[PDB]
Design an enzyme around this catalytic site. Structure first.
Site, PDB file in Angstrom:
ATOM      1  CB  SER A 175      -0.932   0.007   1.211  1.00  0.00           C
ATOM      2  OG  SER A 175      -0.217   0.285   2.397  1.00  0.00           O
ATOM      3  CG  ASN A 207     -10.057   4.022  -0.275  1.00  0.00           C
ATOM      4  OD1 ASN A 207     -10.079   5.171  -0.711  1.00  0.00           O
ATOM      5  ND2 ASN A 207      -9.463   3.700   0.865  1.00  0.00           N
ATOM      6  CD  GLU A 245       1.397 -13.574 -24.202  1.00  0.00           C
ATOM      7  OE1 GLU A 245       1.461 -13.330 -22.980  1.00  0.00           O
ATOM      8  OE2 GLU A 245       1.737 -14.670 -24.690  1.00  0.00           O
TER       9      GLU A 245
END
Ligand SMILES: Nc1nc2c(ncn2[C@@H]2O[C@H](COP(=O)(O)OP(=O)(O)OP(=O)(O)O)[C@@H](O)[C@H]2O)c(=O)[nH]1
Ligand SMILES: Nc1nc2c(ncn2[C@@H]2O[C@H](COP(=O)(O)OP(=O)(O)OP(=O)(O)O)[C@@H](O)[C@H]2O)c(=O)[nH]1
Lengths: 44, 51, 427, 438
Positions: D140, D206, D254
């Site tokens: 975080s 959030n 990819e």
């Protein structure tokens, strides 16, 4: 505007302590606290 | 072995014995192996033609 | 693991510790004898944060209690919980003090500091990994100040990594009975400002005002006063011993809380105090919780934050809440007065939430703040000092002790620095 | 074969894992005991779980993860939850102290005596690992304890393994919401550390999760439960290619090769379309065209930024459930000829399409609907610059007043690293506006 408010309060208060009655103690009991100080100071 | 009693002599001196410390440096970080990303709005070579 | 060792000083500390320990005891659910009672488990697993184990499921306090007055100890001994304490630790003195500061700091403590230090260091070795110490004492009280400045000066050097929380009682701004209480205050604060890290400062007048406004209950007991402050202690220490996120270390808070080394003093606050009948006249909802929470009257430590501005705040919440209501409430009040804050820094709120409430009430909260409102107290005391020291009356006792006025000189300008610096940042 | 390893640091990284496995058990149907039923799969450990679990001879599936924290509370909590038998006890590594949100404290005071254990555990998993495509790392930016440990151990593992990708899924700072004042400090520290060694770093915020929650999910008292539930569904979607089979397949290799244009700039965004409430889905219709319209609706993204103010670089869209390439190509052509989306004159196409037949699943007792056609949206845009443009003019102020710096200087660091982070961020922006410019 707030300065107008406070100054008008001051001139209003002072000119009322000339009356022949009224004595010593009440004056001092209002000296420090005439109106709760708090001049609204941008109240919220 | 004993208690070293501080006698009524003194205390700190006008806010002394503190932790303030601005030191100075410019020490670099590690190596950013990742090269320059743009070519600054310029050109490779192409378009070669021949009659 | 992480553990705390409690220190109790002075005649305030005598009853402070009593109320505080009984609160935490009946919180975790221990009988007066000391045998465990398993109803909730998490408390049992985390009891090691404070208690030390005794065989047969008994849980002794990790307290160290000291005074010079023996009657207070005897009353604590006789109280309905004092038996929980251990006779090993009642280090005391051999006379009174008259709560003269110079006596309390220089002559008497010389022969007791050794014993108190040895006991506390035995306890410190016994425990595993200490966050730090909490002291319950007085700053206006004499003998508590005399012993406490000594001990707090002693311990910092050995343990300079540890959280040396000091929790005190501040003299009344109106009348304090004790008269050399000023001089006690100046001499105590002179060390305390340099030495402590965090200090909670609370005063009795606002407790009485709280009794009139919300308790309404006419005749209180100083015990009930101590209950109203033990609630604050319980709250501020809830978070360590219980699950549910909130990074709870008081240091985790302190670094977030204080901006500068000479800024240690804080002003507490409690959450719902319900009157005689408002219990069913209140919708117990987070909005009004916060409404009362951050108020000019719910506050009870020193003086209204109105006179100044806030640097930082920290609010702890305990109960089955959610992020949203508290977060948007904080945004709402931030908008409501985005002026009395400091553009110095944005988002000067700290929030913490824990899920297991205390018992009796479902939602709860505790407030602590750092605001530009200590100048009131310290101004007041500064002019008191100048007035009294003008003709230095009653200073003969201190001259006899060996106290001489150069220590007053060194302290007064430190408080001058305090006042000037506080006013300087915010203005 | 096609397996990866999971790491969680800081106490922000633990609920999200807890939920990720609360889901990830279900799609192969493993009870908290940890045993597939008598249905014939048990043995050495080869079947679709193989990417996630190593169910050995005792019949007990094993998460290929590590949860490191620095305070025993939550780790012991989960060790006392239902899944204690499910997890490997010392895969849950506990420390005893907090970082105080002080990045340098967490990076120098304590980081020296757990990295040994954690890297040894990494080795004793990587040995049995076969394909070892890479790692899924949860930290975080407002790292209460995650930040410094993440930086140090990430540097160590980056230098020790130089032949695989690295994925970072970070909760980005809330632009106008803060529970921490040291947040700008440790955030920019982590940024100017990680940008040179993260291979693909994705952000999420959030506040917008809540905004979606009370716009379309119709619920007004959500929590971490619903937040992390949908986030875990997102990571499940991005790993579904490895999980199940389908018409054709995609992979993180990819994703790297085609999504990120250039060196450095590797900060894309994620989006999920069919987050709909039960009643709302009950008597309404869902299909490719409307789900794509709702996804490119600007406010449905999870970062407070305006693509209309931005300009687009790349887009990879993954469809999960049952679809047909006819409608796929038709709708994507409609969007290609749409008008508001300003694609750069550089890229004529911007669309990497992936399909898988297996629809996403529900969690028991959750909140999302009973969906048949889900889709995940990954995108490189130039619109993200606003976040850093906002952060810098807060940090410059609070640093010119240099409050709180006593902590860091007294524990060892100094203003030079902060000063350097300044120009690292500056180079970031400076590159962004010029690549956005035609
Ligand atoms: N425990 C307790 N303290 C009280 C009570 N009422 C007031 N106090 C205050 O608590 C203060 C602190 O006492 P101590 O910490 O023991 O201070 P001291 O060194 O003994 O010095 P003095 O207070 O002058 O006796 C006193 O000064 C009182 O102002 C009470 O009812 N119980
Ligand atoms: N995904 C997730 N995020 C969380 C959780 N709890 C808090 N957060 C957010 O993520 C951040 C957590 O980081 P920190 O508070 O530093 O946690 P930490 O670094 O693990 O350690 P601490 O200092 O003990 O808090 C906070 O800003 C929270 O708002 C959680 O349980 N799950």
């Amino acid at each position: 505007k707030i300065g107008h408010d406070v100054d008008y309060d001051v001139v209003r208060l002072r000119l009322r302590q000339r009356h022949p009655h009224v004595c010593y103690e009440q004056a001092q009991r209002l000296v420090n606290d005439w109106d709760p100080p708090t001049p609204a100071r941008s109240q919220t | 072995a004993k208690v070293e009693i501080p006698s009524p002599k003194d205390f700190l001196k006008k806010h002394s014995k503190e932790k303030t410390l601005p030191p100075k440096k410019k020490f670099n970080r590690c190596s950013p192996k990742k090269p320059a990303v743009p070519l600054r709005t310029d050109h490779p070579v192409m378009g070669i033609q021949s009659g | 693991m992480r553990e705390i060792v409690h220190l109790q000083a002075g005649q305030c500390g005598n009853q402070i510790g009593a109320k505080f320990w009984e609160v935490i005891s009946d919180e975790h659910g221990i009988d007066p004898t000391g045998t465990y009672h398993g109803d909730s488990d998490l408390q049992l697993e985390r009891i090691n944060v404070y208690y030390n184990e005794a065989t047969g499921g008994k849980y002794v306090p990790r307290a160290v209690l000291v005074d010079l007055e023996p009657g207070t100890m005897d009353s604590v001994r006789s109280g309905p919980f004092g038996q929980i304490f251990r006779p090993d630790n009642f280090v005391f003195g051999q006379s009174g003090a008259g709560n003269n500061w110079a006596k309390g700091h220089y002559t008497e403590g010389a022969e007791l500091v050794d014993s108190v230090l040895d006991v506390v260091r035995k306890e410190a070795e016994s425990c595993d990994c200490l966050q730090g110490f909490q002291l319950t004492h007085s700053l206006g009280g004499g003998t508590g100040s005399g012993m406490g400045t000594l001990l707090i000066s002693k311990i910092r050097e050995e343990y300079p990594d540890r959280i040396m929380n000091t929790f005190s009682v501040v003299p009344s701004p109106k009348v304090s009975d004790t008269v050399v209480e000023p001089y006690n205050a100046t001499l105590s604060v002179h060390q305390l400002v340099e030495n402590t890290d965090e200090t909670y400062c609370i005063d009795n007048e606002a407790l009485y005002d709280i009794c009139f406004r919300t308790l309404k209950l006419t005749t209180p007991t100083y015990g009930d006063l101590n209950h109203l402050v033990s609630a604050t202690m319980s709250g501020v220490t809830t978070c360590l011993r219980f699950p549910g996120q909130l990074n709870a270390d008081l240091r985790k808070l302190a670094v977030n809380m204080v901006p500068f080394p000479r800024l240690h003093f804080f002003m507490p606050g409690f959450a719902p105090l319900t009157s005689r009948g408002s219990q069913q006249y209140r919708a117990l909802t987070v909005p009004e919780l916060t409404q009362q929470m951050f108020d000019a009257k719910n506050m009870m430590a020193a003086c209204d934050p109105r006179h100044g501005r806030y640097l930082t705040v920290a609010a702890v919440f305990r109960g089955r809440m959610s992020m949203k209501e508290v977060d948007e409430q904080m945004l709402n009040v931030q908008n409501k007065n985005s002026s009395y804050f400091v553009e110095w820094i944005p988002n000067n709120v700290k929030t913490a939430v824990c899920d297991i409430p205390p018992r009796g009430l479902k939602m709860s909260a505790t407030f602590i703040g750092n605001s530009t409102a200590i100048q009131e107290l310290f101004k007041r005391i500064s002019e008191q000092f100048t007035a009294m020291f003008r003709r230095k009356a009653f200073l003969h006792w201190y001259t006899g002790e060996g106290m001489d006025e150069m220590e007053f000189t060194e302290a007064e300008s430190n408080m001058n620095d305090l006042v000037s610096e506080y006013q300087q940042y915010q203005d | 074969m096609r397996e990866c390893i999971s790491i969680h640091v800081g106490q922000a990284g633990v609920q999200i894992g807890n939920a990720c496995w609360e889901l990830y058990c279900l799609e192969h149907g493993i009870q908290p005991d940890g045993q597939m039923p008598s249905d014939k799969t048990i043995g050495g450990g080869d079947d679709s779980f193989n990417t996630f679990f190593s169910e050995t001879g005792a019949g007990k599936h094993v998460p290929r993860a590590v949860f490191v924290d620095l305070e025993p509370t939550v780790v012991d909590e989960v060790r006392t939850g239902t899944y204690r038998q499910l997890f490997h006890p010392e895969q849950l590594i506990t420390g005893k102290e907090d970082a105080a949100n002080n990045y340098a404290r967490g990076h120098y005071t304590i980081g020296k005596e757990i990295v040994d254990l954690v890297l040894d555990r990494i080795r004793k998993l990587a040995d049995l690992c076969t394909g070892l495509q890479g790692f899924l790392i949860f930290h975080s930016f407002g790292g209460g304890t995650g930040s410094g440990f993440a930086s140090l151990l990430m540097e160590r593992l980056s230098v020790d393994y130089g032949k695989k990708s690295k994925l970072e899924f970070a909760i980005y700072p809330a632009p106008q919401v803060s529970t921490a004042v040291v947040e700008p400090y440790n955030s920019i520290l982590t940024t100017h550390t990680t940008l040179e060694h993260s291979d693909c770093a994705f952000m999420v915020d959030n506040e917008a999760i809540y905004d979606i929650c009370r716009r379309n999910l119709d619920i007004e008292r959500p929590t971490y439960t619903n937040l992390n539930r949908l986030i875990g569904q997102i990571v499940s979607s991005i790993t579904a290619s490895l999980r199940f089979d389908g018409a054709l397949n995609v992979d993180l290799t990819e994703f790297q090769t085609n999504l990120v244009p250039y060196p450095r700039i590797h900060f894309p965004l994620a989006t999920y379309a069919p987050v709909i409430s039960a009643e709302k889905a009950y008597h309404e219709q869902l299909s490719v065209a409307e789900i794509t319209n709702a996804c490119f609706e600007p406010a449905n993204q999870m970062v407070k930024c305006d693509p209309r103010h931005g300009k687009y670089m790349a887009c990879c869209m993954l469809y999960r459930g049952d679809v047909v390439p006819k409608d796929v190509n038709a709708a994507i052509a409609t969007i290609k000829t749409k008008r508001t989306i300003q694609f750069v004159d550089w890229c004529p196409t911007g669309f990497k399409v992936g399909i898988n037949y297996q629809p996403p699943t529900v969690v028991p007792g959750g909140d999302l609907a009973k969906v048949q056609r889900a889709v995940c949206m990954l995108s490189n845009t130039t619109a993200i610059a606003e976040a850093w443009a906002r952060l810098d003019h807060k940090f410059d102020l609070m640093y010119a007043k240099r409050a709180f710096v006593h902590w860091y200087v007294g524990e060892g660091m100094e203003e030079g690293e902060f000063s350097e982070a300044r120009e690292d961020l500056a180079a970031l922006e400076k590159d962004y506006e010029e690549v956005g410019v035609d």
